[PDB]
Design an enzyme around this catalytic site. Structure first.
Site, short mmCIF file in Angstrom:
data_model
loop_
_atom_site.label_atom_id
_atom_site.label_comp_id
_atom_site.label_asym_id
_atom_site.label_seq_id
_atom_site.Cartn_x
_atom_site.Cartn_y
_atom_site.Cartn_z
N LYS A 5 2.17 4.51 -0.72
CA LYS A 5 1.86 5.84 -1.05
C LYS A 5 2.24 7.13 -0.45
O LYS A 5 3.23 6.98 0.51
CB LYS A 5 0.14 5.84 -0.54
CG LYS A 5 -0.09 5.70 1.05
CD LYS A 5 -1.49 5.35 1.04
CE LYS A 5 -1.83 4.58 2.56
NZ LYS A 5 -1.08 3.35 2.77
N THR A 10 -6.40 6.79 -1.29
CA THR A 10 -5.24 5.84 -1.19
C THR A 10 -5.23 5.13 -2.85
O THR A 10 -4.59 4.27 -3.19
CB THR A 10 -5.41 4.79 -0.35
OG1 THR A 10 -6.55 3.97 -0.42
CG2 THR A 10 -5.20 5.41 1.10
N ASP A 51 0.62 -1.23 -0.02
CA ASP A 51 -0.22 0.05 0.00
C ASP A 51 0.89 1.46 -0.02
O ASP A 51 0.81 2.15 0.79
CB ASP A 51 -1.06 -0.05 1.16
CG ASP A 51 -2.14 1.02 1.04
OD1 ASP A 51 -2.54 1.34 0.04
OD2 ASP A 51 -2.52 1.84 2.02
N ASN A 87 3.35 7.39 3.39
CA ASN A 87 4.08 6.46 4.08
C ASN A 87 5.48 6.99 3.70
O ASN A 87 6.22 6.01 4.17
CB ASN A 87 3.77 5.24 3.45
CG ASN A 87 2.39 4.55 4.06
OD1 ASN A 87 1.77 3.84 3.06
ND2 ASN A 87 2.05 4.89 5.17
N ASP A 119 5.29 1.51 7.16
CA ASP A 119 3.94 0.79 7.20
C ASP A 119 3.82 -0.54 6.10
O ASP A 119 2.91 -0.89 5.97
CB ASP A 119 2.87 1.87 6.92
CG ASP A 119 1.54 1.24 7.66
OD1 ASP A 119 1.85 0.43 8.68
OD2 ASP A 119 0.51 1.55 7.40
C1 LIG Z 1 -4.45 14.23 13.37
C2 LIG Z 1 -3.09 14.60 13.10
N1 LIG Z 1 -2.08 13.62 13.15
C3 LIG Z 1 -1.36 14.13 14.22
C4 LIG Z 1 -1.60 13.53 15.43
C5 LIG Z 1 -1.60 13.00 12.11
C6 LIG Z 1 -0.34 13.56 11.61
N2 LIG Z 1 1.01 12.52 11.95
C7 LIG Z 1 1.73 12.71 12.90
O1 LIG Z 1 2.07 13.61 13.60
C8 LIG Z 1 2.68 11.38 12.98
C9 LIG Z 1 4.01 11.65 13.42
C10 LIG Z 1 4.59 12.63 14.14
N3 LIG Z 1 4.57 10.28 13.29
C11 LIG Z 1 3.90 9.43 12.77
C12 LIG Z 1 3.77 8.03 12.23
C13 LIG Z 1 4.90 7.31 12.45
C14 LIG Z 1 6.00 7.58 12.94
O2 LIG Z 1 6.42 8.77 13.40
N4 LIG Z 1 7.04 6.61 12.93
C15 LIG Z 1 6.36 5.53 12.12
C16 LIG Z 1 6.75 4.22 11.97
C17 LIG Z 1 5.70 3.36 11.35
C18 LIG Z 1 4.31 3.76 11.15
CL1 LIG Z 1 3.29 2.56 10.38
C19 LIG Z 1 3.86 4.93 11.47
C20 LIG Z 1 4.86 5.98 12.02
C21 LIG Z 1 2.67 10.13 12.55
C22 LIG Z 1 1.37 9.66 11.64
#
Ligand SMILES: CCN(CC)CCNC(=O)c1c(C)[nH]c(/C=C2\C(=O)Nc3ccc(Cl)cc32)c1C
Ligand SMILES: [Mg+2]
Length: 421
Positions: free
Chosen positions: A129, A159, A127, A132, A148
């Site tokens: 995108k 997506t 997936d 990610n 992810d």
């Molecule tokens: C509602 C808005 N919200 C903030 C709370 C979405 C914005 N995203 C983030 O602030 C965010 C941050 C600072 N980090 C991440 C996601 C991470 C991340 O920081 N590391 C990480 C590793 C694996 C996977 Cl699957 C996902 C992540 C995310 C989604």
């Protein structure tokens, strides 16, 4: 009863929610995905699953998410991962004033090196995108981290732009990631997706037909090497599609990474700004409506909870009772909950014995007021003209991918009343 302390929700990933948590041992923050076992069907077995987990733990590449821990209990799987704070790739691109094919290639070399490394370890994203693609930090030289990927062979639960036609038929291999990479590249070069539409259904129908073009005026001045690469990556037949590694080593990457004049992408950048901001505003609106429904549900639920704890039926509760009721809403550790209740008792207030219905309203009004300020941020990034208004057409693109002019106040009212209708 563990090692991590939940701080807040970061967002969503494949199969479950991602939480920002503090590691009580070292004080370090981690991104932890929780996959509730009830929310998935296992399509393999525990040994096969744990085999992939061991591969995932061994992934060590500059453009690939690191996985620190995998553990489980009766209810959940837990994946402990690194936090990246640079934001999503495209959110950073749209802050720029200039963009060239060199910049595009420097980005794609990273995405392709990571993707090649995954495929070499028999890991498929499936997936892939832009969301990610996370910048590791706010550092000037920050690397793109792909996040992810993995586990598609072991679990079964916008997506649509990025999905390979073969994935729609549920008959795919690692070549599906090359297609997603080709879509991302197309968008980098001209600023809009190769397979468009107003709804997922419309987008996917174009994807499955597989036809796209390099239209004037956008594609005129793009290099022959870039268009050739796009064509190879968006080859319909997976068996004839080039591999991630071949894409990585393609002349376009070789030529443009060896270095912005003859190959600027100024028009592409303008399009990307409109594309990304409209996508982010749709996402913000969906999240806002999502939060409004959750708030109304939890309101009615907390009222029922507090009502049961109200033994004498006087509609009032003391601090300890309020905490017990708050605890029960979570069930539908104790140290963190007392903070939120006390901080909420500030506006509620001295007497010590308060009407729980007031606690309910003040608690949820703070949820609704917090929701607005997040939608507002996206509205501001979207408001590229000086109007501070969203048109019926722009609003059509929003609701048409969700479920003659209007300002932010009217916009919020339009969505909150839609959660009632
Ligand atoms: C509602 C808005 N919200 C903030 C709370 C979405 C914005 N995203 C983030 O602030 C965010 C941050 C600072 N980090 C991440 C996601 C991470 C991340 O920081 N590391 C990480 C590793 C694996 C996977 Cl699957 C996902 C992540 C995310 C989604
Ligand atoms: Mg009472």
């Amino acid at each position: 009863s563990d090692r991590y302390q939940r701080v807040k929700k970061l967002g969503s990933g494949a199969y479950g929610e991602v939480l920002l948590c503090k590691d009580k041992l070292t004080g370090a923050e981690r991104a932890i995905k929780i996959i509730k076992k009830s929310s998935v069907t296992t399509t393999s077995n525990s040994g096969a699953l744990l085999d992939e987990v061991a591969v995932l733990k061994q992934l060590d590449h500059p453009n690939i998410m690191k996985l620190y821990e995998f553990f489980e209990d009766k209810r959940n799987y837990y994946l402990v991962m690194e936090v990246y704070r640079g934001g999503e790739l495209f959110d950073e691109i749209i802050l720029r004033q200039k963009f060239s094919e060199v910049d595009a290639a420097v980005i794609m070399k990273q995405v392709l090196s990571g993707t090649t490394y995954l495929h070499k370890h028999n890991i498929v994203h499936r997936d892939l995108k832009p969301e990610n693609l996370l910048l590791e930090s706010k550092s000037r030289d920050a690397l793109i981290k792909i996040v992810d990927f993995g586990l598609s062979a072991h679990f079964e639960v916008g997506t649509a732009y990025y999905i390979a036609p073969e994935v729609l038929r549920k008959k795919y291999d690692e070549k599906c990631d090359v297609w997603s990479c080709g879509v991302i590249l197309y968008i980098l070069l001209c600023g809009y997706p190769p397979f468009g539409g107003q709804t997922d259904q419309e987008i996917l129908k174009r994807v499955e037909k597989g036809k796209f073009s390099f239209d004037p005026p956008d594609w005129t001045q793009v290099s022959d090497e870039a268009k050739q690469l796009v064509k190879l990556m968006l080859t319909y037949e997976p068996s004839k599609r080039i591999s991630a590694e071949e894409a990585l080593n393609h002349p376009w990457i070789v030529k443009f990474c060896s270095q912005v004049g003859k190959h600027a992408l100024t028009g592409a950048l303008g399009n990307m700004k409109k594309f990304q901001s409209s996508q982010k505003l749709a996402q913000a609106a969906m999240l806002f409506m999502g939060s409004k429904l959750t708030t109304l549900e939890e309101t009615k639920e907390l009222t029922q909870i507090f009502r049961q704890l109200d033994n004498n039926g006087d509609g009032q509760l003391d601090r300890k009772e309020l905490i017990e009721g708050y605890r029960k809403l979570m069930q539908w550790s104790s140290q963190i909950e007392a903070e939120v209740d006390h901080i909420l008792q500030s506006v509620d207030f001295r007497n010590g014995y308060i009407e729980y219905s007031e606690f309910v309203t003040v608690c949820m009004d703070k949820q609704l007021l917090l929701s607005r300020e997040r939608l507002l941020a996206a509205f501001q990034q979207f408001d590229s003209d000086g109007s501070g208004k969203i048109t019926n057409e722009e609003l059509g693109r929003l609701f048409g991918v969700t479920e003659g002019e209007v300002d932010f106040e009217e916009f919020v009212e339009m969505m909150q009343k839609i959660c009632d209708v």
